[PDB]
Every structure is written in structure tokens, then in C-alpha cells.
Amino acid sequence: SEITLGRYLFERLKQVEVQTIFGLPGDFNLSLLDNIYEVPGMRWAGNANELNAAYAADGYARLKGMSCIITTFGVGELSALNGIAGSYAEHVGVLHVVGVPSVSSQAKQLLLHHTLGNGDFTVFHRMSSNISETTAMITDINTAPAEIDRCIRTTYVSQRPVYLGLPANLVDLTVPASLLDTPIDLSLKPNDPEAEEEVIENVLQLIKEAKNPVILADACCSRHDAKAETKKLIDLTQFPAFVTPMGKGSIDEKHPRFGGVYVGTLSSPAVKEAVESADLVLSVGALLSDFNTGSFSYSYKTKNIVEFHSDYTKIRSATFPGVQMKFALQKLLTKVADAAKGYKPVPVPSEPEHNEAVADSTPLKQEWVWTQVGEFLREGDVVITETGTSAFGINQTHFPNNTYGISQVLWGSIGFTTGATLGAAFAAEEIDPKKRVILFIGDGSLQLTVQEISTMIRWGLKPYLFVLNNDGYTIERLIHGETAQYNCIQNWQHLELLPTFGAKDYEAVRVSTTGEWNKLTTDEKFQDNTRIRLIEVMLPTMDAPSNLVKQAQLTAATNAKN
Amino acid sequence: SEITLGRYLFERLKQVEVQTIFGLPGDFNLSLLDNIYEVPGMRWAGNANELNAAYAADGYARLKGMSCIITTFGVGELSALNGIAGSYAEHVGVLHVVGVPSVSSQAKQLLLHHTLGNGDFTVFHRMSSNISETTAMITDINTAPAEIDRCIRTTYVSQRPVYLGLPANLVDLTVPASLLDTPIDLSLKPNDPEAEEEVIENVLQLIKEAKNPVILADACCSRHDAKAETKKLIDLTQFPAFVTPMGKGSIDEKHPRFGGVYVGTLSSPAVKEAVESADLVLSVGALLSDFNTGSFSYSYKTKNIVEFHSDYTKIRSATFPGVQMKFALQKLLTKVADAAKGYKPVPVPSEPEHNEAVADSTPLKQEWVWTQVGEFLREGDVVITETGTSAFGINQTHFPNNTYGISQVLWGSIGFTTGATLGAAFAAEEIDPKKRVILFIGDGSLQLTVQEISTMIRWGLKPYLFVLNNDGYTIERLIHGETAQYNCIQNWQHLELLPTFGAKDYEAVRVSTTGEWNKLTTDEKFQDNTRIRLIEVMLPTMDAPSNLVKQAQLTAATNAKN
Ligand SMILES: Cc1ncc(C[n+]2csc(CCOP(=O)(O)OP(=O)(O)O)c2C)c(N)n1
Ligand SMILES: Cc1ncc(C[n+]2csc(CCOP(=O)(O)OP(=O)(O)O)c2C)c(N)n1
Ligand SMILES: *[C@@](C)(O)P(=O)(O)OC
Ligand SMILES: *[C@@](C)(O)P(=O)(O)OC
Ligand SMILES: COP(=O)(O)C(C)=O
Ligand SMILES: COP(=O)(O)C(C)=O
Ligand SMILES: COP(=O)(O)[C@H](C)O
Ligand SMILES: COP(=O)(O)[C@H](C)O
Ligand SMILES: [Mg+2]
Ligand SMILES: [Mg+2]
């Protein structure tokens, strides 16, 4: 019993729970794609372009664990590249498979379409190696199952993009089916016993001594799977728990000990103080980007900083190479309650609010929206926020427990979120058909990736697409050129996007007032994810969350340098 | 008197006749873009995404001589790379300007947005250099004016994309205005007199001996500026003249000595016979790609092949390095009427210029449409055909003299032409507003880049957008997977796209029959470019011009072979 190499690929992906495959067809991958239909459960999204396909592979991997996008040599791959880079930047495990010209076309340097016309078949592979954890350009059938397994493990474990090139002529060759009976090894190796035990004792002593210890969960807590441990640590220690913007959603915001979003100097006065006064910081998965830290504005001076990281740990000035956080946290948690039993709980900053009631005629403002969105959310929602006012405003929104956030704070590619939403809707559907996928995207960002709405429609996916109509690039207007033509956009009939892409069962509604907002969002039928929905949210052109106004200025200054 | 470095950039582009600037803003390019408005006549397009911007810059340069897309560090520039790669593949001089972090941001390796989180500011520049003729990352103001000139010259002269990175802090520093008073050198080095003389004596001698000489114009005749020389060569020799698919438009098809489109084995029998029985082939600008040549199908029955190229000449088995075609043809022209004086003109092929009468109710078919296109075209038209049935079908359309064709036969990135259309239409409006820009794009291709229609509306541009609705990817269906779900697309309402993107003054009409076709296209008001039009052409799913049917099969077999 034998299967095609293409077949093997799809069977392996299914074993790591990839059910939906992203990308676009081309002659160089059509035989490969045939195999998808031979694997029970697997489907082909049918994306509207390769850039959006890669954004969607990203959103899907964030929920599902990993994902796979297939493109065609040259023109498919190169289109995906900004999607792949972003997955790299943000530690998202995306397997990028490219259908390439058969080996005999390559050997004989055929002047083929999608080449640069110089007979170099290695160029695109070479470009992609710059943004991949590892790569394979498969030429040898005898090692190919092993290479694919290597690419999958690396994608899954490292959580970085991997590039797999497959000649069209290789994909139809057979491999023994029994190769599939043995699972890919998807584990990490255990820590060094001595190194890890020294980390533990060290952290344990620091905790025993600390009067005002605080926990801070950042991006890599989320990206590298330490969420269950960080949750236990908060429960067992009762230390105040804070979250960065890039880690929003990785810790539960309705826990009695949750103190807020810390963004250095842009934090609320109570959060800034509760954090910066700590005599011990337990940091989980720091990723200190400009926007994630209010332009590098942390101010603690203390030490007793413990940094947990995927592959090492830092304690004060010391680094412990190879001490991986997931196992180190697991081991820590068996002794942490005793270490902390002398801790008298310091009070945490109290949550923001509810908006006060206002006249129903009151026009919508950014500040009011971000607070209100908290009344709409429920446990288990996926909340996706575009770079722009949306990404900044969500910080102030209070998540129910078990809310999965998606915000590309480091890469910051506008338009990402239309595709991330498609891929998240696919993932959610396979996880739990009642989990809601809720997108906030600006009117400008939508334009770059709008066609991926079509793919959501063709699969009957049912996300909520909040479109923030503020007449252009408000985030950019706040940085430079408040009235510059380059910050304006052609205005679109947003309510027409859905039926134009062929939707038949949908809602498209415009909200301009608090009354319209509330009427829509408190409606029981609206709250159920029974159809795709677009909500055009009319806002003032220069209205922004206060943190964005501050940041816009910090950023402007940085660039103009001297 | 001093101007900003940014200003200097734009005054330079104005001197090589770039009036429209493509791309998207981003914080690292905003200061740069301010200067556009400081230079009389220069405009910023405001594209809907960077890939589309890059496609539009390509279309722009094909018409104008060169173009400029400006993007932002990481996220803009990576999004544009497929467009740039296409420009490199097809020899189009696009200058790619990237606004990048200030010099000391890079020096201090700040964890900024749009980086890979690893401190490497060189990686995107390194990626672009694989698909660039040269690059510049500007760091020094004293040398920036010269580096910019070096870039523009290379772009213009080599007709390939150039990469130019401008740190955000440098673009406001100033340079002497007087610099602009010395022209960039835009000229070619001349040929070696001795090597050129050998070439010419050789060709002349062959011409004197030929009874059946023929001329074959190909892609590099247009890309490398030899169309004037080639027209004169046809005039003075009276030899039969043929064009390849990729060079279509580069020679006048209503010339009495025009013999048709040669595509090796995919040629009409009269054309294959006319060319292959030749006893001399004067080949101008050969680019022998799969789709250009019926899968490398040429069967010249002579050894007397002369290949002119930008940088060398070939005669029979001999290569003449450095013998440049523009110059060698100019020299050839001075003696060639005399070498050819004893030539008795052999008759040239044709096909019917016209379709048979049919019932007006006749469903539209590809073969009928492509012949019928010829009755609608006028001299001065720009004819843009997408990869798919459009690009193969146009080969059977008869051009009026002075028809400019754009068909990306080598690179073959679907979606290209929506962008190329925007940029051809800008260019054409600057050249002569009476020049119509006429697009043929499939339902599938349109999906990848549809948002760029928005940018046409914004600027009041008046292309004719013929959209071929055959319910999916017909060209792929003929390659493999006739009814595969991967060759199927979500169905759009093409008639609604234009209002949806804010069009006020426009037409959108569906045509299904020959009579609806004739009614619309023979209408005098329709034939005037006074508004943006979309024509939705309804065609059968498996309907294809017969050339594409054969080519799909060869390609299939090329991809399968071991
Ligand atoms: C791919 C890409 N191109 C350009 C940019 C630069 N950029 C950052 S924010 C922004 C504008 C966002 O506009 P919108 O989505 O309308 O957000 P809001 O008006 O709510 O601020 C742009 C163009 C980017 N981040 N990514
Ligand atoms: C960016 C990109 N992705 C994938 C391909 C592979 N490809 C070539 S033709 C084609 C289908 C185009 O279909 P359509 O425009 O509807 O043309 P038609 O049906 O008239 O043949 C595809 C997906 C490509 N050339 N470029
Ligand atoms: C994250 C950047 O903190 P990590 O170090 O865990 O990621 C690899
Ligand atoms: C064209 C491919 O013939 P060229 O040789 O002029 O290109 C540089
Ligand atoms: C988070 O990853 P999973 O274990 O869910 C998987 C095997 O995909
Ligand atoms: C100097 O302008 P050019 O002639 O170079 C042009 C046609 O762009
Ligand atoms: C080239 O073959 P194909 O995959 O049909 C598309 C043109 O790329
Ligand atoms: C980050 O700066 P910006 O240019 O506004 C966009 C997010 O890049
Ligand atoms: Mg906006
Ligand atoms: Mg089609």
C-alpha cells in the first residue's frame, strides 16, 4: 500500500489538525491539489489572492496551531511574501508549500513562464529563506517523506514559517502508506535538569522575598503556548496579573487579580503605578516592540526581573540558555503555592467601567465604542483588530474570560485582518461552530484586502465585519499630514460589498449613533452567528483613542530623527 | 538655493517624464511624499494596495519610458515584490523607492514595527536585490544626489526595476538646487566599430543571397526601443514581417507586408509555412518563452538566423558580444535598401479580417469575439490582455496601425492587468487623452486585484474594462482539473463593482449574444472614451481559442514528465 507524495503531505497535515488549505492554483501545483479531495475532511479555501491566502493561513494557524498555504512558482509565492514575513515577525507557524517546475524543466533551464527569463530556478527559494525558519526544495523522492516531516515539525514547534518546494513531477510519485502510522515527533526536548532546577530555586527565593510581586504576560506567552501555565501561576500565587497589547487575550480579564493592560508610559495612571512599583516582575514572553511598549517607555529600575522565554530564562543580569519556559513553569507550579503562602494580596487597579447612559442620538466616538464593545463580547469570541485606531482602541476594551485576541502589533501590515478573519473563521468553525469571529477593521485597511470577503461568503462563514468609516487613514493623519491627499481614500459603498461578492444570506447595517449601536448589538438575534454581517461604523475623521494620539507623536519624532 | 533630497528625487523624475507616483503611504515615507505636491504637475495615485501599485507602475513605464512606486519599509515593499519581479522578467524600468527607518533607528537596532523583531534592517533590501538591476540604500547626504541619478539612469537605460531605500531622516535634508541643471546621462555606450562592421557586412551579404527573407519582431523590440528601426527595416526591405505573441503591437499589422503572428507549431498553417520556409530570418528581440513559442516549437528550415538583441548579436552559430541592436540596426538601415534591391516580394499570408453573418441571438464564443474585437479597435489604442483565454485570443485579433499591446506572456501573473490598466491610463492621459485604454481580463484574474478599479474612479480615468465571465479559471481547466473545485470561483456581480467603489459617471452592461455585442460596440457614443465602462462578456465555461487548447496540453505534459 502506497500513496502519492502529495497524498502523504495532506495526510500528515491532517494528523496535525490542518483541515483547510489556503493559496491559489497554478499549473505547477494542480496535481498536488488533487490530493486534497482524497483526504476525508480536508478542504481547499479557494482564496481570492495569494497575499490574502497567507494572511488567512496566519489567522488559521493562530487558532489551530499551524496551517498550510500552497502557491505556484514565482508569481504565487512572491505575492504571499508579506503574509509569510508577518508570520515570521510574530511567531506564527505557517507551512508555505510551493508547486515548482518539474526537475527536468529545471535541469534543462527551460524558458518557462513565471521565471525571470534567466534560467535561475533557485531565486524565489533564496528570497524566501530570509523569512523562514527552515526550507526544503525537494529533489529526492527517497528522502521526501522525511523532509516533509522535518518541515512540519519545525513549523509546528518553532512557530515560524517554513518553505517547502515541490516539483510537479515529484508529487505524483508513490511512497509507502505505512510511513503515516508513525506520528511526526512534535515535542520539545526536556530542559537540562540542573539548569532548570537552578532557575526554579532562584525564582522561588525571589517570590518568597517579594512584598509587591507582579505577573506580566506578553506576546510569546500566547505565540509559544504558555497560557495554561501562566493561568495556573496567577491562580496559585494571587499576584496581580497584567497583559501587554500584543498579549491581550492570553490571560483572563475577568479574573479578580487581573490589573490591566500595561503599555509603559501610555498605561492608565493606576496600571502604570501598580506595575512600576512592583519589587519583582514575573515576565512571560516579552516582545518589546515600539508600539507594544509605548515607544520603549518601561520604567522599573528594580530588577528582580524574571524573564520567561520560549528557549531561555533571564533572572536579573543572568541568562540561562536553553531553559525553556513551558517546562520550567510546569515545574515551578508544583512548588509555587508554598513559596507564595506568606503573600498578602495587594489590591489591583479596578476595571474601566460601563459607559454612562447617553441620549440615543449621540454620535459615535472611538472612546465610547471601545468601552461598549465589552458589553457585546462573550466568552469564546475571537476578536480581530486591524493596525490603526482599531488596534489601539481594543486595549481599553474589557475582554470576557476565554477571549482569543488577534492584533499584529509588531508587523503592522494593514489589510492583514481581512484575510486573518477568513482563516480564523475556518479554524473556529472546526473548533466550535458557536464561537464568534469579530473583526474591527478600518476603511483604509479594508481596501487592500477586500476581496477575501468573497471567500468567506463562498464557504458560508459568519464573521462580524465592523468597518470603521472615518474617511481615510486617521492613524496616519495623527502622525503627519492631517489633511494630506495621501491620507485620503476613495470612498466605497461598504453596505454593497457583500451582495456584490455574491452574498445571499447576510446583513449589512450602518450605525452612526449610540442608540443605533445599542439597538443592533443588544438584539438577541444579532448576537447569534447565523449569517455573515458587515456593520459600517461612522466615526469622526480625527477621532482616535488617547493612547494613539500620544503614540502618533512619539513615532513621528523617532523617524525624523535628526 | 537648496531643495530637500525628496524634492530632488521628484524633480529628477519629472525630467524623465514621470508625472504620476505610485504606492501607499507609511510613516517612514510620509515626509518624502509631501514633496510631490511641491512640484508642478506631479501627482500621487493613492493606490488601493502595493502589489496593484507595482503592477500600475509597470503599465505606466511601458507607455512612458519609466515609472516610480514608493512603498514603506517591510510591509509595503514586500507586498510589491511580485510586481517588481514581473518588471524584471519583462524588462520594465520601475524605480522602487522605499521609505525606511532613520539611520540612528537602524544603528541602535530598535525593535520597530515592520521589522522581523531581530534587529536586521538589511533583509528586505537583500530580498529585493534578487529582482533588481542594482540597488541603493542611501546613508550619506553628500552622495545621495549622485546615487539617485545612478538609480534613475540604470532604470531608464536597462529597462529593469531598481531599488532605492531612503531613510526617513535624510529626505528633509537639503542639497544644491543647481544639481538639477545638469541632465542625468541617459545614453547608451556606442558599439565597437569593428565588431559592428562585421555584423553588418555579414547581414548585408546574407540579405543579398536570400530569396525568401523574413523579419520576426519579438518582445525585446518593444522593451528595448527598436520599433522605429524595425519599422524602417520593413519599409526599406519590403520583406514579409511577423510578430510573436509577446511582441504583438510592436509592428504595424495593417502594413501590406505584415504576414501574421508566428507561434511555432501553434501558428496558422499559412504563417508557419511563410516563416519556416524562409531562407533568412531577421529576428529582432527574441525572447523564446514557452507561451511565446508554442512550447519551444520553432522549426526554421534554414540555418540563416540573425538574432538582434539589446546587448549582442547572433548570426548563425556565431555570437557577437557587445553588438547592440538599436545601434546595429541604425547602421544596417544605411546600407539595407541597396542590399535588398534585387528582392522580388513573395506574397504574405492572411486570415479573414471578418466574421460570417450569424443570428444576432447567437451566444458569444471566444473565436468569434477575438476576430470581432478588430472592428472595434482604432489607431492609438492601448490593448491590455490578461493571462488566460484573453491573452491567447488576442493573437487572432487584427490590430490597426499604431496599436500598443500589453500581454505579460513570460511572467504571467494573473491580476497584473487591473493594475497595468490604471497605470497605462494615467500614462495615456499624459500622452494624448484621445488614446483609449482597453482591458480584456477574466472573471478569475479580476478577483486578485479588483480594488484598483477604485483608483481609476478616483482619478476620473476612462478605461473600457471587458470582463470575461466563463464561471472560473478556464485556462487551468484545459490544463488539468476540468471540473476541479480549485478551478471554480465565487461568482461576483460585476455590474455592481463600479458603483460599489464610488463611481458616479460610468456604464456597466452585460453582453451574451453577438447582437448585444454589435449593438454596444458599433455605438458611436460607446466608442468615445468619455467615461469608465465595464462590459461583462458572458461565455461558456470550457470555451477557449483553439491555440490555448493545444498549449494547455503541452504545458500539462511538460509538468508531468520525469
Ligand atoms: C501593507 C501596508 N501598507 C501601508 C502601511 C502603513 N499604514 C499604517 S496605518 C495605515 C492607515 C490605516 O487606515 P485605516 O484602516 O482606515 O485606520 P484608521 O482610519 O481607523 O486609523 C497605513 C497606510 C501598513 N502598515 N501596511
Ligand atoms: C498571481 C498568480 N496566481 C496563480 C496563477 C496561475 N494561474 C494562471 S491562469 C489562472 C486562471 C485565470 O482565470 P481567468 O482570469 O478567469 O481566465 P480564463 O477563464 O479567461 O482563462 C491562474 C489561477 C498566476 N498566473 N498568477
Ligand atoms: C518571545 C519573543 O518572548 P520568545 O523568546 O519566547 O520567542 C521565541
Ligand atoms: C531581448 C530578450 O531579446 P534582449 O536580449 O534585448 O534583452 C536584454
Ligand atoms: C495547538 O496545536 P494542536 O496540538 O492543537 C495541533 C496538533 O494542531
Ligand atoms: C528625457 O525624457 P525621456 O525622453 O527620457 C522619456 C521618453 O521618458
Ligand atoms: C501557467 O500555467 P497556469 O498555472 O495555467 C498559470 C498561467 O500560471
Ligand atoms: C506604523 O506607522 P504607520 O506608517 O502609521 C503604519 C502602521 O505603518
Ligand atoms: Mg480610516
Ligand atoms: Mg474565467
The answer, yes or no, to whether any atom of ligand 4 lies below 6 A from the CB of B310, is: yes
CA distance B251 to A440: 52
- Half-sphere exposure of residue A533: CA atoms within 13 angstroms, side-chain side: 22
Which 304-323 residues of chain A touch chain B by CB within 8 A?
none
Closest CA in chain B for residue A30? B480
Q: What kind and span of H or E run contains B89?
A: helix B75-89
Residue pair B371/B355 in contact by the 8 Å Cβ criterion: yes
Residues 6+ apart with CB under 8 A from A388: A414, A442, A444, A445, A468, A473, A474, A475
Residues 6+ apart with CB under 8 A from B255: B234, B241, B401
Nearest alpha carbon to residue B539 among B484, B481, B472, B482:
B472
How many Cβ atoms are within 10 Å of A375's Cβ, its own excluded? 14
Considering the domain B352-553, what is its CATH architecture?
3-Layer(aba) Sandwich (3.40)
Q: What is the CATH number of domain A352-552?
A: 3.40.50.970
Residues 6+ apart with CB under 8 A from B347: none
The answer, yes or no, to whether any atom of ligand 3 lies below 6 A from the CB of A244, is: no
Cα angle A26, B77, A471; round to 5: 100
Determine the residue type at B447.
Q
- State the DSSP string of A175-235: EEGGGGGSPPP-PPPPPPHHHHHHHHHHHHHHHHH-SSEEEEE-HHHHHTT-HHHHHHHHH
State whether residue B473 sits within 8 Å of chain A by CB.
yes
What number does the ligand 2 atom closest to the CA of B414 have? 26
- Half-sphere exposure of residue B365: CA atoms within 13 angstroms, side-chain side: 10
Partners of B296 on chain A (C-beta within 8 Å) are: 110-111
Nearest alpha carbon to residue A291 among B115, B124, B73:
B115
Mutate to test the pocket of ligand 3, among A88, A90, A216, A223 (most ligand atoms within 8 A of CB): A223
First to last CA, chain B: 67
Beta strands in A303-416 (DSSP E): 305-309, 312-315, 318-321, 382-385, 404-406
Mutate to test the interface with A, among B39, B82, B220, B551 (most CBs of A within 10 A): B82
Nearest CB to B496: which of A30, A126, A500?
A500
Mutate to test the pocket of ligand 2, among B52, B473, B483, B559 (most ligand atoms within 8 A of CB): B473
The pocket of ion ligand 10, defined by CB under 5 A, consists of B 442-444, 470, 474
- State the DSSP string of A279-328: SEEEEES----TGGGTTT--------EEEEETTEEEETTEEEET--HHHH
Q: Which residues line the pocket of ligand 5, CB cutoff 6 A? A: A 16-17, 64-66
Ligand 7 center to residue B443 CA distance, Å? Answer: 15
* Residue ranges covered by each domain of chain B: 1-187, 188-351, 352-553
What long-range pairs does B307-314 form, CB within 8 A, spacing at least 24? Answer: B307/B283, B308/B226, B308/B282, B308/B283, B308/B284, B309/B220, B309/B224, B309/B285, B310/B220, B310/B224, B310/B285, B313/B199
CA distance B352 to A322: 76
State whether residue A34 sits within 8 Å of chain B by CB.
yes
> Order of strands across the sheet with A404-406?
A404-406, A382-385, A437-442, A464-469, A532-538, A506-511
Give the orientation angle of helix B75-89 with respect to helix B416-431, to 10 degrees: 80
- Half-sphere exposure of residue B512: CA atoms within 13 angstroms, side-chain side: 1
Name which residue sits closest to atom 2 of ligand 4, judged by CA. B287
Q: What kind and span of H or E run contains A71?
A: strand A67-72
Catalytic-role residue among B46, B65, B114, B149:
B114
CATH class given for the domain over A1-187: alpha beta
Classify the C-alpha dihedral B417-B419-B425-B431 as positive or negative.
Answer: negative
The answer to whether B28 contacts A115, with C-beta atoms less than 8 Å apart, is no
State whether residue B348 sits within 8 Å of chain A by CB.
no
Phi, psi dihedrals of residue B455, rounded to the nearest 5°? -65, -35
Which 232-291 residues of chain A touch chain B by CB within 8 A?
287-291
Chain CA centroid to CA B429, Å: 17
State whether residue B507 sits within 8 Å of chain A by CB.
no
For chain A, give the number of residues: 562
Partners of B288 on chain A (C-beta within 8 Å) are: 111
Nearest alpha carbon to residue A474 among A540, A556, A557:
A540
State whether residue B28 sits within 8 Å of chain A by CB.
yes
Nearest alpha carbon to residue B254 among B381, B366, B387:
B381
- Which residue in the block uniquely carries the three cell numbers 509555412? B273
CA distance A22 to A36: 11
Largest CA distance in chain A: 75
How many Cβ atoms are within 10 Å of A489's Cβ, its own excluded? 21
Nearest alpha carbon to residue B551 among B371, B293, B370, B300:
B293
The answer, yes or no, to whether any atom of ligand 8 lies below 6 A from the CB of B27, is: yes
Residue pair B523/B344 in contact by the 8 Å Cβ criterion: no
Residue pair B439/B466 in contact by the 8 Å Cβ criterion: yes
- Which residue in the block uniquely carries the three cell numbers 483526504? A39
Catalytic-role residue among B412, B415, B419, B423:
B412
Nearest alpha carbon to residue B536 among B405, B454, B424, B442:
B442
Q: In this structure, what C-alpha cell is assigned to residue B184?
A: 542625468
- Which residue in the block uniquely carries the three cell numbers 527559494? A125
- How buried is residue A522: exposed, middle or buried, by Cβ count under 10 Å (0-12/13-18/19+)? exposed
Q: A474 labelled as ligand-binding?
A: yes
CA distance B423 to B69: 11
Regarding beta strands B280-284 and B213-217, do their DSSP bridges make them parallel or antiparallel, or are they unpaired? parallel
The answer, yes or no, to whether any atom of ligand 4 lies below 6 A from the CB of B309, is: yes
Residue B354 appears among annotated catalytic residues: no
Helix, strand, coil proportions of chain B in percent (round to 5)? 40, 15, 40
How many Cβ atoms are within 10 Å of B442's Cβ, its own excluded? 28
Ligand 4 center to residue A121 CA distance, Å? Answer: 19
CA distance B141 to B145: 8
- State the DSSP string of A424-465: HHHHHHHH-TT--EEEEEEHHHHHHHTTHHHHHHHTT---EE
Mutate to test the interface with A, among B35, B70, B79, B123 (most CBs of A within 10 A): B79
CA distance A505 to A471: 28
3-state DSSP call for residue A63?
helix
Phi, psi dihedrals of residue B525, rounded to the nearest 5°? -70, -40
Q: How far is B504 from chain A (nearest CA, A)?
A: 12
Domains B188-351 and B352-553 agree in fold:
yes
Q: In this structure, what C-alpha cell is assigned to residue A228?
A: 495554561
Name which residue sits closest to atom 5 of ligand 3, judged by CA. A309
Nearest alpha carbon to residue A61 among A38, A84, A77, A79:
A84
In eight-state DSSP terms, residue B167 is: E
Mutate to test the interface with A, among B448, B453, B473, B474 (most CBs of A within 10 A): B448
The answer to whether A111 contacts B488, with C-beta atoms less than 8 Å apart, is no
- Which residue in the block uniquely carries the three cell numbers 523617532? A558
Determine the residue type at A513.
T
CA distance B136 to A19: 44
In eight-state DSSP terms, residue B513 is: B
Nearest alpha carbon to residue B61 among B288, B258, B188, B223:
B223
CA distance A229 to A284: 10
Q: B476 labelled as ligand-binding?
A: yes
How many Cβ atoms are within 10 Å of B88's Cβ, its own excluded? 23
CA distance B471 to B30: 42
Q: In this structure, what C-alpha cell is assigned to residue A69?
A: 498555504
How was this structure determined? It was done by X-ray
CA distance B509 to B324: 48
Cα angle B16, B23, A97; round to 5: 120
The answer to whether A488 contacts B113, with C-beta atoms less than 8 Å apart, is no
First to last CA, chain A: 68
CA distance A522 to A537: 16
CA distance A158 to A176: 28
CA distance B128 to A165: 20
The answer, yes or no, to whether any atom of ligand 3 lies below 6 A from the CB of A246, is: no
Nearest alpha carbon to residue A239 among A304, A175, A324:
A304
Nearest CB to A458: which of B25, B490, B556?
B490
The answer to whether B131 contacts A114, with C-beta atoms less than 8 Å apart, is no
Residues 6+ apart with CB under 8 A from B511: B364, B517, B520, B535, B536, B537, B538
CA distance B228 to B244: 17
Torsion of Cα atoms, B392 then B395 then B401 then B407, to 10°: 30
- Which residue in the block uniquely carries the three cell numbers 528522502? A143
Mutate to test the interface with A, among B75, B458, B487 (most CBs of A within 10 A): B75
Ligand 1 center to residue A3 CA distance, Å? Answer: 46
CA distance A332 to A325: 10
Determine the residue type at A274.
A
CA distance B222 to B285: 8
The answer, yes or no, to whether any atom of ligand 2 lies below 6 A from the CB of B473, is: yes
How many Cβ atoms are within 10 Å of B553's Cβ, its own excluded? 13
Nearest CB to B486: which of A25, A409, A499?
A25
3-state DSSP call for residue A137?
strand
Ligand 2 center to residue B402 CA distance, Å? Answer: 29
Chain CA centroid to CA A164, Å: 22
The answer to whether B168 contacts A476, with C-beta atoms less than 8 Å apart, is no
Q: How far is B205 from chain A (nearest CA, A)?
A: 32
- Which residue in the block uniquely carries the three cell numbers 525568401? B212
Closest CA in chain B for residue A287? B117
Q: B449 labelled as ligand-binding?
A: no
The answer to whether B48 contacts A79, with C-beta atoms less than 8 Å apart, is no
Nearest alpha carbon to residue B112 among B168, B73, B81:
B73
Q: How far is B432 from chain A (nearest CA, A)?
A: 25
How many Cβ atoms are within 10 Å of B504's Cβ, its own excluded? 10
The answer, yes or no, to whether any atom of ligand 1 lies below 6 A from the CB of A474, is: yes
The answer to whether B27 contacts A116, with C-beta atoms less than 8 Å apart, is no
Catalytic (active-site) positions of A: 27, 50, 113-114, 412, 443, 470, 472, 476
Q: A234 labelled as ligand-binding?
A: no
Fold of B188-351: Rossmann fold (3.40.50)
